[PDB]
Amino acid sequence: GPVPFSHCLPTEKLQRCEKIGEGVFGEVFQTIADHTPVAIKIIAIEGPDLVNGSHQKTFEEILPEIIISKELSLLSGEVCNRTEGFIGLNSVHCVQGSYPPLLLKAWDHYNSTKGSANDRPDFFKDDQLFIVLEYEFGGIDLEQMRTKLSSLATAKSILHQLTASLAVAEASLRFEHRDLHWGNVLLKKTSLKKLHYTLNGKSSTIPSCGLQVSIIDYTLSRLERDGIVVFCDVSMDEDLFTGDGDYQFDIYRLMKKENNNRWGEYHPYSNVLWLHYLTDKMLKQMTFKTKCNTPAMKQIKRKIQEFHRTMLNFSSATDLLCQHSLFK
């Protein structure tokens, strides 16, 4: 049955919590235990209050995200289809209580410095249920790194890492991410020169450029095992297909066109659509500390531009990884 918050966030861990992100879903905090940072995602469930302007999910509605988190985390320890490019899942708990005052303090600090679009989560009663997901800390999102990357060479490593992770998940799980906006691509420093993956038993490497990429946020994702499909049915959602002002919002429409509004089906072209949106961000919105000033950098730019104009003619991330010249 549900545990108190203190089960997940013993005092010292709660005292070290800093807010790092948010969405309509709820709140994300960073903390530390056994000298290791972790990210804690907290989602209210089962209650009647609007939270951030939206109804709370039921436990049945939140289960897909929990299941998908686990399956993608487990890919780091598999053999035939192996990738560390998702995000590690450490634990999941169902908690009952009002929001901890120490988390309110962290929430207020973020509101003061960065500003929040959410409600201050101070209105929950002591019977409120939450899902608390503890993840590996994955670094900083690509959107927050808009002005922080070295060069377009780094962009190439990032797109290769994303494409490989998505391909491995296609092959093992018939996975579609379905919401891979640039807030959901995390970057962390690595001392490894090369990152390793295995796709259908064939192992390969990717030069890191000093960064390891982690894909997060499985709210809209789909996968299947042995014919049992886990997904978010958005066929009757209005608002998801009516956004404007960013190619992101076109991707939701383009996915609905590809799948004829049947969200249980497998359409791995959606992963190609998201990779095209990310490549577009790399070329149009990211700005690098070092431009392509030399001939050999102008070449990497030309190859990423060629990827942008050709990739929509590939059927899946697997097709892109295996056949696109960018990755040869």
Binding site for ligand 5ID (CB under 6 A): 20-21, 23, 28, 39, 87, 135-138, 141, 183, 186, 216-217
Closest CA to 252 of 179, 168, 174: 179
Residue 157 Cβ vs ligand 5ID, minimum distance, rounded to whole Å: 19
**Strand pairing category for 223-225 and 228-230:** antiparallel
Closest residue to Na ion, based on beta-carbon distance: 214
Q: Is 179 annotated as a binding residue?
A: yes
Positions 84 through 113 that interact with Na ion (CB under 5 A):
84
Closer CB to ligand 5ID, residue 46 or residue 141?
141
CB of 280 to Na ion, least distance (A): 23
Task: State the number of CA atoms in the 13 A half-sphere of 92 facing the CB.
Answer: 15
141 binds, among ligand 5ID, Na ion, none (CB under 5 to 8 A by kind): ligand 5ID
Instruction: Extract the tokens encoding 252.
Output: 């939701």
Is there a binding annotation on residue 41? yes
Q: How many CA atoms lie within 13 A of 226 on its CB side?
A: 0
Closest residue to ligand 5ID, based on beta-carbon distance: 21
Which partner in Na ion, ligand 5ID, none is near 198 (CB below 5 to 8 A by kind)? Answer: none
Closest distance of CB 180 from ligand 5ID, Å: 11
> Was 24 annotated as part of a binding site?
yes
Q: Angle 295-310/152-173 helices, nearest 10 degrees?
A: 30
Q: Is residue 181 part of an annotated ligand binding site?
A: yes
State in angstroms the smallest separation of the CB of 186 from Na ion: 8
**Ligand-binding site membership of 216 (annotated):** no
d(CA 220, CA 290): 36
Answer yes or no: are the C-beta atoms of 134 and 86 closer than 8 Å: no
Task: Choose which of 69, 128, 198, 214 interacts with Na ion (CB under 5 A).
Answer: 214
Residue 319 annotated as catalytic:
no
**Contact flag: residue 83 with Na ion (CB under 5 A):** no
Residue 56 contacts Na ion per CB under 5 A: no
319-326 contacts: CB < 8 A, separation 24 or more?
A: 319/272, 320/163, 320/167, 320/272, 320/275, 321/163, 321/164, 321/167, 321/199, 322/167, 322/199, 324/163, 326/156, 326/159, 326/160
Segment lying near Na ion (by CB under 5 A), choices 77-85, 97-105, 114-122, 254-262:
77-85
Alpha-carbon gap, residue 224 to 261, rounded angstroms: 18
Report d(CA 298, CA 258) in Å as an integer. Answer: 34
- Residue 54's Cβ-count burial label (10 Å; 0-12, 13-18, 19+) is exposed
CB of 253 to ligand 5ID, least distance (A): 22
* 47 appears as a binding residue in the annotation: no
Concatenated DSSP letters for 29-59?
EEEEETTEEEEEEEEEES-SSEETTEEPBPH
Q: Residue 241 in 3-state DSSP? A: helix
Q: How far is the CB of 318 from ligand 5ID (least distance, A)?
A: 25
Decide which of ligand 5ID, Na ion, none touches 103; Cβ closer than 5 to 8 Å per partner kind. none
What is the C-alpha to C-alpha distance for residues 186 and 295, in angstroms, rounded to an integer? 30
Of 122, 179, 233, 246, the catalytic one is 179
What does DSSP assign to residue 260? T
Question: By rule CB under 5 A, what string of x and - marks binding of each residue 148-187 to Na ion?
Answer: ----------------------------------------
Closest to ligand 5ID by CB, 65 vs 319, is: 65
Binding-site residues for ATP sit at 20-28, 41, 136-141, 179-184, 217-219
Write out the residues near Na ion by the rule CB under 5 A: 84, 214
Residues with a catalytic annotation lie at: 179
